Amino acid sequence: DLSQCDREPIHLLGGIQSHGVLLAFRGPDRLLEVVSANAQALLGRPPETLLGQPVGRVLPAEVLAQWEPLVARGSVRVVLPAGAYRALLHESDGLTVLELEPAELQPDGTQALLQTAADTVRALTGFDRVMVYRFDADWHGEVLAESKRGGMDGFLGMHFPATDIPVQARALYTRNPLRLIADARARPVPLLPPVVPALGRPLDLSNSALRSVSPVHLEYLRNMGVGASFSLSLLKEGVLWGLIACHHLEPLHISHERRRACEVLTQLLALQLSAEER
Amino acid sequence: DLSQCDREPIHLLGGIQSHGVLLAFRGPDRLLEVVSANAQALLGRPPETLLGQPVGRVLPAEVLAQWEPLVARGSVRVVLPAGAYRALLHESDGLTVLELEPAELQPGTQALLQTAADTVRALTGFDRVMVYRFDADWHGEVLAESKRGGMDGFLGMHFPATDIPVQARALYTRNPLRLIADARARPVPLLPPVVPALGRPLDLSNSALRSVSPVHLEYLRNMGVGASFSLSLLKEGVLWGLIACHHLEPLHISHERRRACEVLTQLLALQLSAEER
Amino acid sequence: DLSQCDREPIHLLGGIQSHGVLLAFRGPDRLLEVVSANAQALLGRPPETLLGQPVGRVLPAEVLAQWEPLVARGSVRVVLPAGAYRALLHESDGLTVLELEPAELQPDGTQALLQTAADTVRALTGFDRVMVYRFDADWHGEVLAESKRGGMDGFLGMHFPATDIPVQARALYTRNPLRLIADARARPVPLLPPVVPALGRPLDLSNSALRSVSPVHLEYLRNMGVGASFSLSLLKEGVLWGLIACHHLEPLHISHERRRACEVLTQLLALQLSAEER
Amino acid sequence: DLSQCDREPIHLLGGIQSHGVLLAFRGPDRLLEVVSANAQALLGRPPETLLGQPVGRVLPAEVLAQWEPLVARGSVRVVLPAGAYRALLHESDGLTVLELEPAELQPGTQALLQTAADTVRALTGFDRVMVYRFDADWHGEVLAESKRGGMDGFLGMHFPATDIPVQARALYTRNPLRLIADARARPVPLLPPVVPALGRPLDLSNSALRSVSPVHLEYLRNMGVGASFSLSLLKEGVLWGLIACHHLEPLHISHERRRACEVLTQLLALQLSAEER
Ligand SMILES: *C/C=C1/C(=C/C2=NC(=C\c3[nH]c(/C=C4\NC(=O)C(C=C)=C4C)c(C)c3CCC(=O)O)/C(CCC(=O)O)=C2C)NC(=O)[C@H]1C
Ligand SMILES: *C/C=C1/C(=C/C2=NC(=C\c3[nH]c(/C=C4\NC(=O)C(C=C)=C4C)c(C)c3CCC(=O)O)/C(CCC(=O)O)=C2C)NC(=O)[C@H]1C
Ligand SMILES: *C/C=C1/C(=C/C2=NC(=C\c3[nH]c(/C=C4\NC(=O)C(C=C)=C4C)c(C)c3CCC(=O)O)/C(CCC(=O)O)=C2C)NC(=O)[C@H]1C
Ligand SMILES: *C/C=C1/C(=C/C2=NC(=C\c3[nH]c(/C=C4\NC(=O)C(C=C)=C4C)c(C)c3CCC(=O)O)/C(CCC(=O)O)=C2C)NC(=O)[C@H]1C
């Protein structure tokens, strides 16, 4: 292994991916306590200025409009002057975290089972390459199926993720079905303040959609020429069983409809993997 | 996974330990969706009856009294006709989960972990306290021991090697304190067996009363262990080790000394990291 | 104040507590220059006889055995015919001071932080009462937390040590983390000779474990019915910040393991008090 | 404490005054653990290089020559190629600390303190000498003054009241003599910034070269003070007062007259106590 990074607190890196914006706030006043340093391009004020403020005079008016279904359902589509956005709400460290990400406009045998899953996910995402790993007893990911376009750069990248995926990464994969790295060549954006005063550490990004990625893994994607990477967790009876990894040589937006279909497919596959016995 | 029992979804077992009571509810009406089957002795109605009801007409009034700091602080002590209780609130699967547990009434590196072992044994009063440090294969190595004179579980410095599954280590990372009040007690099922909105049992990752894997409960019984109380040692937010306390019978620890136990794990986490930078 | 005693040279009283024995010696011959008047019960010769002698024919053979780790580490446990003892070595006035004290046998918010410290120390010592003082800008100790057994003689002794703890006492508390008065009803033992010839004054007992206590404070403990008193200095960034005072109505040996855990706790607390800013 | 600067750990500032050099080492190998950053001009190697080395191959040979009386007497004069030096040895934090400072070459109660003031001004040659007596609130009261004709720091009988912090008075109690050679000079940092074995800087309570609190150094500069030389007046081992000498520029005092200064403080301590018993 590489113990120097297999103890990496990947939930505490204090950064997001640059295509979105993250805000966090506590209390009934809804006072901003965390804000990504890139937030001015979307919110019209400098981040150090927005700290301390209630969200009512911080969020764009289009978001505050949909605030009720946003709390109810945890997500809502909104149309900002900057374009279409997805808003996503979850709870963490006692803070309510708000993530804004660009969206399209809305105006007017077991190997055989996993092979069809591979082909199905590649059809839904359009990504060049899709790989399905199954974890063995040593938690090595075994390449079990591949779907790919004809004539490929990333050849047969059938190498196992061996003494590989650290426990903290597998724990996040268990708690989140979908993980998107929009562009491995893009730069992470730091969260402000660097440590949350109430916590003595950075905000926990375990369930954050925009969570920046361990540099060691981002470098592994870049060496492969991978731009976008989109991953689906395969659970069996609530336990991590495998991983579907989609790699595309450049950014390629997937869109919410086909992302949601991807997650439903992981739920359908979990049923099929468990019910095969009982 | 890591064998016949290391694939166990220990967060989804659907039970609590029998010394406490758990309720869960969604929505602004606060409609009961989850209830432990033992709840009648504390709430005065059958659980199958309390399902569907708002909490305002479900919880005892002493609890609803302190409901503001209970939501505010996440915990509050209350005095019920049955005696003193701790109420504990967290969110899970979109439900807000309330746990009621009885309480008393209210009117070098090896050397550092050696003192930690002696400090925890004095705070808990438990017969034996062990400090494990996890190596690179996530095997726990016994690094310090504090224990009373003349022991039944004498010198247990046998390592937990191909042992503590990832799901257990993940919960040790997310919760600083874990208490098994009595390994001879029986788990109490949560009702309904699967949450209708979820298709599975309520996720008990952050539950104080979460029941115990039958295989580990059986291993505790074989040792003559009654109570088991664990403190997670984190370094820079990553699981580093475990302080495991074993007692031959039940022994209440009490909130003051639990809270002192948790502060010590925070103090120790500073010392393990700041030792470098 | 009481200026008649707030200039008391409490480091120069020339006495020890009666439960231990103190020896001091200079030079490469290691010639006894200071000896407590109670030393015969442990060493088998009269103190005036042991003066001038090298330690090789003065110390018990069990102590001279462990002399190497005693110098190396500053402390060592030894088993004498009289029972188990702790030996403690430090330097003072150019003399090397040796203190022997009985030991058990070894054969086969900020207020919330200080409240847990109070409860933790009471658990480690077993003393009836534990009080935590924090010093304000006038160096008054403010009672900030209390841990105590149910149903108490020393009620709520929440009175501040006000125009109180003299500067010389606070200086010794800064230089020593742990201070034990084994029994406030016991009698101090004089050091011989009454003044050290080389110095023109008594041996400086600033860092002595057995140092006898100012009579005015010993009388204050007795009036409270206090037998044992065990104190821990709280430092922040090397400066005296507060004091944890343990009082027990009778003698109660604490034992080295739990004393050492007590001192580590004061070091851990000092980190938490300083790092809270930087 | 006693304000924004009266909590200052003046024994832990991690610097020395730039006119001298400090080394510290532990163990029987005499391994360098502390070294002032200015040490190369005197020892001929970079400080970061000398760390880890035994002193026998670190100190100049003239110093190791006199090493027996240096350990014996605690001080010895040596003649280096750079000129005459004083070597000074004491123990602190388990380290033995060696300080090198340049030296010249060697081939009623008010009335008593008035003569003491005139005696110290003649011994030091400094422009102004003040005698403070501490009252019961540990405020220093000006009790006698000796000074040259026509003064810049004319008649400074303003009291140091809510002033001299406890940490400064504790060091005045433990050291009879304190010299600030030049308040316009710059402190030299000790390397490494914290002692690895200690988690903090070396304790400089008994160091001759110990640097000065920035706030007090700035107050000296505002007065046009270059050199400052202090004598502690003890009565029965307790701090009683201070003789403070101020000079508008650096002025070496020389060991003979420093030693005479210290003997006078001992003679005065006899007279202040024996006046009763
Ligand atoms: C230092 C820790 C390591 C590590 C971290 C890591 N891997 C993740 C997902 C993942 N990694 C791989 C394969 C590799 N990643 C590497 O860095 C290397 C070698 C240098 C390899 C061979 C795979 C196949 C996967 C599954 C996802 C995929 O694209 O296939 C993650 C989580 C990333 C995230 O989404 O946040 C982390 C943190 N991987 C290691 O091998 C070691 C070096
Ligand atoms: C089937 C899975 C296994 C398993 C589950 C498990 N262990 C936990 C804590 C823990 N276990 C041990 C040691 C053992 N437990 C066993 O069942 C056996 C062998 C039969 C051994 C040797 C230790 C030392 C620890 C640390 C805690 C302690 O008391 O010392 C837990 C979490 C329990 C909880 O709090 O919920 C689980 C789920 N342990 C395994 O070894 C395999 C069998
Ligand atoms: C004449 C000097 C005084 C003095 C000396 C003193 N106090 C010490 C510790 C300590 N004292 C108190 C409280 C009191 N001590 C008293 O004598 C009186 C009044 C008569 C009071 C109110 C406290 C709270 C503490 C902290 C320790 C504790 O048990 O709480 C010491 C050092 C003793 C030692 O360990 O050597 C000295 C020398 N205290 C004064 O108030 C004045 C009278
Ligand atoms: C922030 C802490 C303070 C402080 C520290 C201090 N004083 C020392 C000796 C000393 N100071 C004074 C008078 C002053 N020093 C000041 O900074 C100020 C105001 C800005 C005043 C009025 C005197 C008279 C003395 C006695 C020595 C002398 O030269 O007269 C020392 C020790 C210096 C040393 O040798 O290391 C310290 C650390 N003094 C304070 O008044 C407050 C501000």
Residue numbers in the entry:
A (entry chain A), C (entry chain A): 9 to 116, 137 to 306
B (entry chain B), D (entry chain B): 9 to 115, 137 to 306
Authors' description from the paper:
Phytochromes are red-light photoreceptors first identified in plants, with homologs found in bacteria and fungi, that regulate a variety of critical physiological processes. They undergo a reversible photocycle between two distinct states: a red-light-absorbing Pr form and a far-red light-absorbing Pfr form. BphPs exist as dimers where each strand of amino acids has the same chemical composition (sequence). BphPs consist of a photosensory core module (PCM) and an output effector module (OM) [Fig. 1(a)]. The PCM consists of three domains: PAS (Per-Arndt-Sim), GAF (cGMP phosphodiesterase/adenylyl cyclase/FhIA), and PHY (phytochrome-specific GAF-related). The central chromophore, biliverdin (BV) [Fig. 1(b)], is a heme-derived open-chain tetrapyrrole (consisting of pyrrole rings A–D) which is covalently bound via its 3″ position to a conserved N-terminal cysteine (Cys13).
In addition, we demonstrate how crystals of a severely truncated fragment of SaBphP2 can be obtained from which an x-ray structure with a very unusual chromophore configuration is determined. The overall structure of the fragment differs from those of the CBD of SaBphP1 and the CBD part of the SaBphP2 PCM. The asymmetric unit harbors a dimer (dimer-NCS) where the subunits are related by non-crystallographic symmetry (NCS) [Fig. 5(a)]. Subunits in the dimer-NCS interact much differently than in the CBDs of the other constructs. A dimer of dimers (dimer-SYM) is formed through crystallographic symmetry [Fig. 5(b)]. However, the angle between the interface helices is about 90° rather than around 35° as observed for the other constructs mentioned. The interfaces of both the dimer-NCS and the dimer-SYM are very different from those normally observed in CBD and PCMs of BphPs. The most notable difference to all other phytochromes, however, is the structure of the BV chromophore. Rather being in a stretched-out (all-Z) syn–syn–anti configuration, the BV assumes a curved all-Z, all-syn configuration [Fig. 6(a)], which has never been observed so far. However, BV cannot close to heme again, as this requires a reduction reaction. Consequently, ring-D is stacked on top of ring A, and the BV forms a spiral staircase [with the pyrrole rings as four steps, Fig. 6(a)] in both subunits. Nevertheless, the fragmentation results in an interesting chromophore configuration and large amino acid displacements that were never seen before in phytochromes and that could even be transiently occupied at some stage in the photocycle.
